From a paper:
A GluA2 mutant (F231A) increasing NTD dynamics phenocopies this behaviour, and exhibits reduced synaptic responses, reflecting the anchoring function of the AMPAR NTD at the synapse. The Phe231 to alanine mutation, which destabilizes this interface, slowed desensitization recovery of GluA2(F231A), both in the absence and presence of TARPs (γ2 and γ3). To probe the relationship between NTD stability and gating further, we determined a cryo-EM structure of resting-state GluA2(F231A) fused to TARP γ2 (GluA2(F231A)/γ2; edited at the R/G site), a receptor combination permitting comparison with existing GluA2/γ2 structures.
AMPA glutamate receptors (AMPARs), the primary mediators of excitatory neurotransmission in the brain, are either GluA2 subunit-containing and thus Ca2+-impermeable, or GluA2-lacking and Ca2+-permeable. AMPA glutamate receptors (AMPARs) mediate rapid signalling throughout the brain, and orchestrate various forms of synaptic plasticity that underlie learning. These cation channels assemble in various combinations from four core subunits, GluA1–4, with each contributing unique gating kinetics, trafficking and subsynaptic localization. AMPARs exhibit a modular architecture with a two-layer extracellular region connected to the transmembrane ion channel (transmembrane domain, TMD). The ion channel is encircled by diverse auxiliary subunits, modulating receptor gating kinetics, pharmacology and ion flux, with the transmembrane AMPAR regulatory proteins (TARPs γ2, γ3, γ4, γ5, γ7, γ8) being the most abundant.
Author numbering:
A (entry chain F): 5 to 43, 55 to 84, 92 to 162, 173 to 210
B (entry chain A): 505 to 551, 571 to 634, 784 to 823
C (entry chain D): 505 to 551, 570 to 635, 782 to 823
D (entry chain B): 506 to 551, 570 to 635, 782 to 823
E (entry chain C): 505 to 549, 571 to 634, 784 to 823
F (entry chain E), H (entry chain G): 5 to 42, 55 to 84, 92 to 162, 173 to 210
G (entry chain H): 5 to 43, 55 to 84, 93 to 162, 173 to 210
Write the structure that this text describes.
């Protein structure tokens, strides 16, 4: 039904945005074995921005990861240094949320729901590129933390919500043809 | 020490590719299916649903079914890049498996050759599990329909 | 005597996979075909996969050959998808292990107490024997069907 | 010491020389054009247009779909040789990649074991191409839709 | 002696399999096509050209327009599919063996595949395109003459 | 040709059940070369008892010692208790029971579907059992006629399942007329 | 046209039979580097039955191949005898007989089908024979002209089989119109 | 639309012809470290003249000597005489003539067809030329703008052939209707 579909789209959009925002701000992406603070190797957090230390003589200390301690490698290093792709995923999810909010008001436009669908799909694609860039940048034991999987779950939910938005727009234009 | 013959893992058929490659293959599959669904069925000026998009993408990855292919420029772009991706990834899987077996065969210590059922048993487990799941789903749908008749 | 290289046996094209893998492949083929037939056509609410067409589908999926028909149901698609995955793994693994065999010859002494060569016809003769045997069998079956249907025309 | 390198993006093209890729593209265009010509040029038989010929050729090479197969003698000649070509080239790609991954040969830039699983770093480029293609597809679809919407107003 | 790098043959793409395997492949292809045609059309109760096409596409692991529907046709198709799978796998495996062994050869003290290695397949391809164009034009001239003058 | 179909399915069900039960109970699954009850001599090992022959004290034989990374423990457990061969036997029994009850309380033509489902599931269980058996054997040899009795049970069970489903389809076809 | 098809089938049948008989008879199957007669090395014909010396101390001496000095034994049995090439010749002869009897004792319309089946079977027998020959030999050299006579026989036999089946189809077509 | 198409095909024909003629004429096909007119220095080699650059006597050009198995001799011949690039140029010229003659004699449509066949054939000749060139070179370096002019000529020739065939189909649809 239309009401249930719209509610489920809105809830999914909010969930995806919240998950991606948490992931891009929290620090538990990679349980590697690095250095807490330098200039003895122990376990670490190593998020997207700050590599907090754990299980060492001093815990909880965080330093900004040393991005830039080969132009092909330089561009990847730059793209990982910022999180243009994770951040862009967050922005696109936010803009999709704005579109869905404008759906209820100022309605009968029928092209803002399409916009929401396009934004959610694009957010998913941005997220996947971000994940690949991140995993590639760390190839130079380990494990992935819950913030990484929050990013992944965000991707899946964003794709589902995009499907819902596109399907919902198709109905409007079917109704608007009957 | 005794050579200590290795016991293969059940899901050892995934060894040729890193865990992150499998993960990203699944994400790419979802993305491709969704985008194919969107570009194919989204413009009033045309009316591959989501389920058919998913099926199309799977049988491209498995180098299998060819039931229906996109006819539009956008659908064809999506299909073509997914076919490229699939070709590279499957070729790479086979090549790295061959590397694994060839290298493991030329080890000479300080002084059977065929592939055993243990090396692939996990794929059989998945197969039979999938057959069971399929039967369950079919029976669930049949029970639903049989209970949905007006009484 | 030094363990010289063995002459390739007829039916050496099966050597990459253990006998148990072949046997279980055949069992899996029968099971998949039967489950596809069951799921495809058992509910009266569905009323092209009969048992013979299910078997054909499964065979051609294994030999990565044609399709001709694809399940359209959820459950038939589950069955097809797992069979496709199985096929991909098993065929890839056959090719990989055969490459391993041909790359490195590994001789072993029967008792204990290099500029690689083109495959010869001896290395795949068995598959030719099977092919021509199958062609003969096909002709025989066709002629039996024709003779039978001809007698049915008499009466 | 040579110290085996970190694999580059677009290293999935390494099994075949740059010239093979270039000539594959040329052969693809040639095949598509000749299939189109030899199928839609006789007025004495007026599906294989220019975009359906290109699609046929693409899918034949990627060992993928078959919407249509040429039914004429000439289209079948073209299809058969393109199929042969495809089989050889793809087999050769897989075989040479296996050779690369089996034996590592580090090269000294100046002169005067355990076979790890394959990492996301040496297939990354194919993922980038895939997502770029998805973005391009979405763009093309939206352009077509905007164009059709504006034209329908009149 | 100097290394004397060996020029690959124009048709070196046939090297993984012996000459007799290629010969017998061609014989097998003709036999399969003919038997498929007989067991499919002989009963008063897949013509030759369509049966040849089916067999060709089966061998190149490629096309799939039509497939036999009868028991006999399906037996023929099944054995041909098995044969194809074994032969193509064996070709790829032996090519990999060739390239791997040639790659581990150390002399006394790129690695990509060059256009010279696959030149013959390009020659065949363009020859086939020329032949196709010629056949098309011959048919068209014949059809133009065929109309009652 | 209904009527003969019922006899053929009943015979097949009984044959499959008998074959699988004999296979489980009998112990000629594997002609290995190991130690009898506690020199290496041949043995007709089975699902339960690794049993001796051509030895000093042939015919005296014992219970296989299944046990000496949770995966190894779980596989050893699943193979110790022949849960999958036994489940195959149970499912074949239930399938046969449904086919027998297809005479009583007739006109349901919905339990014979259950018969088909039971036979198919018995076959799947059987194949999983074979795979676990062979896998656990890897923790010269040959396979005995008990192994092949299990395999033949699988094949016949699948055929009988196909017949049962076909009969259910035919029954609903008649009903829809 | 229909009139020429009989001529093409018959002449092709005769050509195939003659080529296969010549191939089975003549000695130029394999230009090997062999022994002219035992108890050094020179080029040799090595036909199907007799290997015959050439370019040697006494050029022209021809001897019987010593085929012999369990799968290998059976292959030796099938190769030393030429059951498959000989069977090809027999089947081509019977196909020719069927074509000849097409006119005399006419209107049977299954004699033409028998001709087609015989020619196709002769082709298949020929291929099996070629594979057995080549397999037996290995484990330089070249293939003589009798070998390629056998190969050309195979091709022509298959073409003639196709023609025969086509003629049978055309009869049973007219018949129904 | 129509009317534009003739101009576009004419322009494309001229562009392809000019590019291919320049490419065959000029000498920046290959940047390699060879020897100038007869140390090492960068040498833009062409189809005919290998010539010296960034040296003491840059701008000195020498005729390439294409000679010191039969395949090697024939490849050396086919590459020495750039028969395939030249044939590409000739076919492009003939295609241009056919397009030009289209405006006259317009009642006959087989001259706009011939134009398409010539352009497509020019593309095929170009491909064979590139393959022989690269192969002969193979029995550090880079490709110069002449090589890519040949490549672009191939692309445009194929596009123009497509357009020519397309307009032949229209012309024959108007007369069908
Ligand atoms: C037909 C239609 C579909 C066709 C495809 C459509 C389009 C293809 C899209 C192009 C992607 C490839 C370029 C990215 C890249 O290589 O840059 C860098 C990483 O790259 C990144 O980190 C960028 C990741 C984003 C890629 C595109 C996302 C678009 C949405 C790598 O640097 P480089 O200098 O590029 O590397 C040179 C090569 N080398 C590594 C061997 C030395
Ligand atoms: C949508 C499409 C439907 C697809 C349906 C997919 C269904 C997936 C089902 C898979 C079953 C997994 C079995 C299992 O865990 O195996 C165990 C073996 O122990 C046994 O012997 C397994 C028992 C038989 C399994 C019967 C089904 C071991 O597994 P693990 O411990 O998890 O493996 C980790 C460690 N290891 C690799 C070293 C082993
Ligand atoms: C769907 C229909 C499918 C078609 C169905 C079945 C088709 C099977 C056809 C027959 C198979 C050949 C039998 C065979 O290989 O025997 C011998 C060779 O064989 C020969 O040398 C005989 C030559 C003619 C055989 C072909 C008949 C047509 C080999 O000896 P063996 O005793 O078989 O032992 C195997 C060899 N090994 C022990 C060294 C490994
Ligand atoms: C039904 C479908 C259509 C099927 C088939 C279609 C027909 C295919 C015809 C193509 C034949 C090409 C050819 O034979 O080149 C020869 C010359 O090789 C060279 O010296 C290189 C020069 C190449 C120029 C040839 C262009 C062909 C284009 C055509 C326009 C190869 O050398 P060779 O002397 O023939 O043989 C020995 C070579 N070897 C020892 C190196 C292995
Ligand atoms: C619409 C389509 C219908 C559905 C089509 C379904 C077919 C595809 C299934 C593929 C295999 C899936 C299972 C993959 C195996 C997972 C095993 C695994 O993850 O192993 C863990 C390992 O121990 C390390 O963690
Ligand atoms: C429904 C339509 C029917 C289509 C049917 C198509 C057939 C496809 C399979 C053919 C290969 C089967 C033959 C495999 C023979 C194996 C040889 C063997 O048994 O090995 C010998 C021995 O065990 C070791 O020495
Ligand atoms: C008819 C409509 C079909 C639509 C088309 C579908 C897509 C075609 C498939 C694959 C594209 C592959 C693109 C390959 C990109 C190569 C990138 C590359 O070459 O970069 C490496 C660099 O040169 C090293 O230094
Ligand atoms: C019914 C439709 C028919 C479609 C028809 C198109 C199919 C063409 C396929 C493959 C051609 C391969 C040609 C093989 C040529 C290789 C010959 C060769 O070179 O052999 C001599 C060798 O070089 C000495 O060393
Ligand atoms: C086509 C759909 C296929 C989906 C398959 C889902 C399988 C999920 C298994 C996840 C295992 C994750 C292992 C964690 C490893 C780690 O990071 O330590
Ligand atoms: C869509 C194609 C099917 C493939 C889906 C497979 C998903 C596998 C998920 C990851 C598990 C394998 C990783 C191994 C972990 C390890 O090294 O211990
Ligand atoms: C998809 C179903 C059929 C596919 C073809 C499978 C071939 C079956 C072969 C079974 C017996 C193999 C015996 C090999 C072991 C040995 O040589 O001792
Ligand atoms: C069917 C035709 C298309 C098939 C896909 C081919 C795409 C690859 C082309 C890349 C061009 C060559 C550049 C890579 C070589 C290098 O720089 O080392
Ligand atoms: C169904 C057709 C399959 C493809 C056929 C490929 C062409 C093979 C023709 C025989 C070539 C012989 C090559 C070996 C040459 C030699 O070493 O003397
Ligand atoms: C259908 C796919 C199209 C292919 C797209 C090709 C884009 C990459 C081209 C890179 C060219 C690099 C130039 C090499 C320089 C040289 O050595 O001459």
């Amino acid at each position: 039904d239309r009401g249930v579909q719209m509610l489920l789209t809105t809830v999914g959009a909010f969930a995806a945005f919240s998950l991606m925002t948490i992931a891009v701000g929290t620090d538990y992406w990679l349980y590697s074995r690095g250095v807490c603070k330098t200039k003895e190797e122990v376990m670490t957090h190593s998020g997207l921005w700050r590599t907090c230390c754990l299980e060492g003589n001093f815990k909880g200390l965080c330093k900004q990861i040393d991005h830039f301690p080969d132009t092909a490698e330089y561009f990847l290093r730059a793209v990982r240094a910022s999180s243009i792709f994770p951040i862009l995923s967050v922005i696109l999810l936010f803009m999709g949320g704005l579109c869905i909010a404008a759906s209820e008001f100022y309605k009968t436009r029928h092209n803002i729901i399409l916009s929401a669908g396009i934004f959610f799909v694009s957010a998913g694609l941005s997220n996947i590129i971000g994940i690949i860039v991140y995993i590639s940048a760390n190839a130079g034991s380990y494990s992935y933390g819950w913030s990484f999987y929050f990013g992944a779950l965000s991707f899946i939910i964003a794709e589902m919500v995009g499907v819902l938005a596109v399907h919902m727009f198709i109905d409007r234009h079917k109704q608007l043809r009957a | 020490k005794k050579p200590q013959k290795s016991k293969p893992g059940v899901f050892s058929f995934l060894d040729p590719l890193a865990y992150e490659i499998w993960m990203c293959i699944v994400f790419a599959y979802i993305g491709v299916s969704v985008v194919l669904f969107l570009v194919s069925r989204f413009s009033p000026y045309e009316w591959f649903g989501i389920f058919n998009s998913l099926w199309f993408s799977l049988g491209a990855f498995m180098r299998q079914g060819c039931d229906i292919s996109p006819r539009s420029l956008s659908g064809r772009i999506v299909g073509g890049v997914w076919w490229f991706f699939t070709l590279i990834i499957i070729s790479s899987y086979t090549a790295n498996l061959a590397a694994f077996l060839t290298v493991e065969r030329m080890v000479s210590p300080i002084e059977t050759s065929a592939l055993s059922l243990s090396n692939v048993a996990g794929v059989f487990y998945i197969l039979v599990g999938g057959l069971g799941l399929a039967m369950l789903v079919a029976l669930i749908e049949f029970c639903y329909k049989s209970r949905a008749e007006a009484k």
